[PDB]
Amino acid sequence: DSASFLERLAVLAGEFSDIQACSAAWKADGVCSTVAGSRPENVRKNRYKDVLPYDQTRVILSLLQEEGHSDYINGNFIRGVDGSLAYIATQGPLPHTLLDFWRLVWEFGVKVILMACREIENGRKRCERYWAQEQEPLQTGLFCITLIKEKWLNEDIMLRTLKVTFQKESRSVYQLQYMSWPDRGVPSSPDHMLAMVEEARRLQGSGPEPLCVHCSAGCGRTGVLCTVDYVRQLLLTQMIPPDFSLFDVVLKMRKQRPAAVQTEEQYRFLYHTVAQMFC
Question: Which residue ranges traverse the bilayer?
C-alpha cells in the first residue's frame, strides 16, 4: 500500500535543488574529506579532478598489499536496505587502474558488475575495456579475464559472462552493460534499465557481496542505478513505509558517493522509474 507514495505524487526541480543545497551544506559542515584521493601518489588514479572519493566511505584495498600495491581506488561503499555494504560505486577504470579495478572485484567477492556507460561517448574516452573479447583473453597484471558468453537482453543491455582467474582460482563474474545512455539527457523510458536491475538481482542471488556499479565518473548514472535497486529491494521485501521519501534516499546516497544522482534530469528519471515500479 505505501507504494500512498503515488497518491502523494517544478516540484521535482525544487526538490532536486533542495537535495543539492543539503548535500552542499553537509560537505561544508559534516564529516567529509578527500585526503586520500588528493595524495600525490593517488592523483593520477582519478579520472576527473573534481571527483574524489570521500574518505569516510572509501574502498580500502588490501589485496596484494604484501606485494606493495596501494590501498587506493576511486570508489566508495554505499549502504543497502539492511544497513550492510550493498554497493561499491566506482569510476570507469583507466589504463593504469585496470589492475586496481580487478583487485576490488576479487577482494570483495563481487558476482555482478553494472556498467552504465560506453568505452567512448561522443568522441571522448569514458572507460577502459576491462572485459575480454571472443577468443582474446585479457591479462591485467596477475588477472586473466576470459569471455565465456555475450547476450543482448534487450536493445540497450549487454550481459557478459566472464571467467576471472587469479592465483590459481577461477570465478564467474557477470557484467551488465547499458549500451545507449545518451550523451545529453536520460533514456527514453525506464524499462530497459529496470530489466538490467532485475537481471543483476537474479545473478547476485542471496548473500552479502556488494554489487559493483560504475559509469565514467561513478556519480550520476551510478547513483541512479544504486537508488533504483535500493528502492526495488524495499518494495520486494514489503518495507516501503507510508512516509517513504525518495528525497531522503538520494540525499543519503550523496553522503556516501560524491554527486550520486548528479542532475535534475536524472532525478526526474529516477522518479519515473520508481513510479513505474510502484505501478
Answer: none
Residue 180: alpha-carbon gap to chain centroid: 17
What's the grid cell of residue 63? Answer: 589485496
> Scanning the structure block, which residue is given the C-alpha cell 604484501?
66
Residue 243 marked as a ligand binder: no
Residue 108 in contact with residue 63, Cβ under 8 Å?
Answer: no
215 is catalytic: yes
With vertex at residue 160, the alpha carbon angle to CA 157 and CA 164, rounded to the nearest 5 degrees, is: 150
For residue 161, which of 214, 229, 100, 113 has the smallest C-alpha distance?
113
3-class DSSP assignment, residue 7: helix
132 is in an annotated binding site: no
Instruction: Exactly one of 127, 212, 215, 226 is catalytic; name it.
Output: 215
Is 183 annotated to bind a ligand? Reply is yes
Do residues 253 and 78 touch, judged by C-beta distance below 8 A?
Answer: yes
CA dist 107 → 63, 69, 100, 209, 212 (Å): 6, 13, 10, 10, 12
What 3-state class would DSSP assign to 124?
A: strand
Q: Does an H or E element contain 75, and which?
A: strand 72-79
Q: Does 32 belong to an annotated binding site?
A: no
Q: Is 44 exposed, middle or buried (0-12, 13-18, 19+ CB in 10 A)?
A: exposed
E-assigned strands of 92-234?
A: 112-115, 120-121, 124-125, 138-140, 143-154, 157-166, 169-178, 211-214
Determine contact, residues 63/106, Cβ cutoff 8 Å: yes
In order of their start, the domains of the chain are 1-279 (3.90.190.10)
This structure was determined by X-ray
